Hints:
Keywords: ATP-binding, mRNA processing, Nucleotide-binding, Nucleus. By secondary structure, the protein is α+β, with helices and mostly antiparallel strands.
Amino acid sequence: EENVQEFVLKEDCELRFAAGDDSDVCLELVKGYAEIFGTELLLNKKYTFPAKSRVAAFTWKGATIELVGTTESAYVAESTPMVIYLNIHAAMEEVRKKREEQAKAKGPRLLLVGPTDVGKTTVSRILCNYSVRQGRTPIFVELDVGQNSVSVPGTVAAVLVQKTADVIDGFERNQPIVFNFGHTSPSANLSLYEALFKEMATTLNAQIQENDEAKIGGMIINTCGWVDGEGYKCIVKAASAFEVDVVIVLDHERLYSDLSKELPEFVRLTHVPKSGGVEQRTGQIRSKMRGENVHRYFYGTRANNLYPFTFDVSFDDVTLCKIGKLVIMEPSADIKHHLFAFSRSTKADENVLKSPVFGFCLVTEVDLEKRTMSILCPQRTIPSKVLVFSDITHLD
Length: 396
Ligand SMILES: Nc1ncnc2c1ncn2[C@@H]1O[C@H](COP(=O)(O)OP(=O)(O)NP(=O)(O)O)[C@@H](O)[C@H]1O
Ligand SMILES: [Mg+2]
């Protein structure tokens, strides 16, 4: 509402706060310098964070910050691993220059691993932002099909980062490369998951041959939290497929010891602690968040609204298929509420499995007698006649 809280942050402190369950909180930096997960704050700009937001504003040299509205929590932390996360960037940049002097230059590729809720996504964000602030253009690769910060759930995705994340909305989602996995966990089909990220690595390697800035920018790769059992071998295959030269393990000493013995000796492995400000989720909140991600795909944000179309499509004008080999689907009541991917492949081939997607639509109604379905779509006509099933559902 109207009530105010003021905070003085010494050097190397962060204001950690969570917005209430019900209302916005607005942050304003009123003296000094501060950043939120790597993005510089502008002085006296009012940043409106929505309900449930969890945020840290960090300062290297000292800051004073005002928060307007109700907070569930808000305190200043005097100890962070931020210098750790900064020295990782410094080290990547050092590799970049040496490899520039050695010459086109191939930038460092970094894999972030660790269990759930250790601040992995936040750390990728910081590292991407610090690369941009250095003048570089890194590729952010997102292998977490549950909580994906680039596309919808059930995807493996990658974007070229050319600007710092917006403090509220995250990175711009401009022309991502997107593969439809179709499930919220790799365990649903681990062999397909591994095939998809291998196809992702192969595609990116050939893409960067046509863009030197992207090539030297390198890659920051976020993984999911499945580190045990089969998840472990999956980490090793990802390290190999993407030819990473740095693995950052967050808050897992056994995983660190195991990887140190297994990875090629040329790979640098760094164990770092999680921040004390990382919030543990539950399954319910994770589900809630997947739904909000899908909504954002179609409708956008408060800052940048997207205006999707709803229209009807004849069963005759599209072919529905499902992976798991390809199988063709006869449109039924059960496709209702499901996301489908518009495949870049021209027919319902073997090639559907290997192909990135144009984008997604949501099947909102199924008229079996009229033989038409209603879809929510980011564009006015379908970009492809090959629609690939995702097990992710969304009530809108
Ligand atoms: N230093 C911090 N202070 C306050 N909040 C933070 C901090 N670091 C992370 N968070 C918040 O904690 C939540 C979880 O962080 P996140 O970086 O998604 O962890 P994660 O390891 O990627 N989770 P998952 O991928 O679901 O296993 C997010 O809302 C962040 O904004
Ligand atoms: Mg994450």
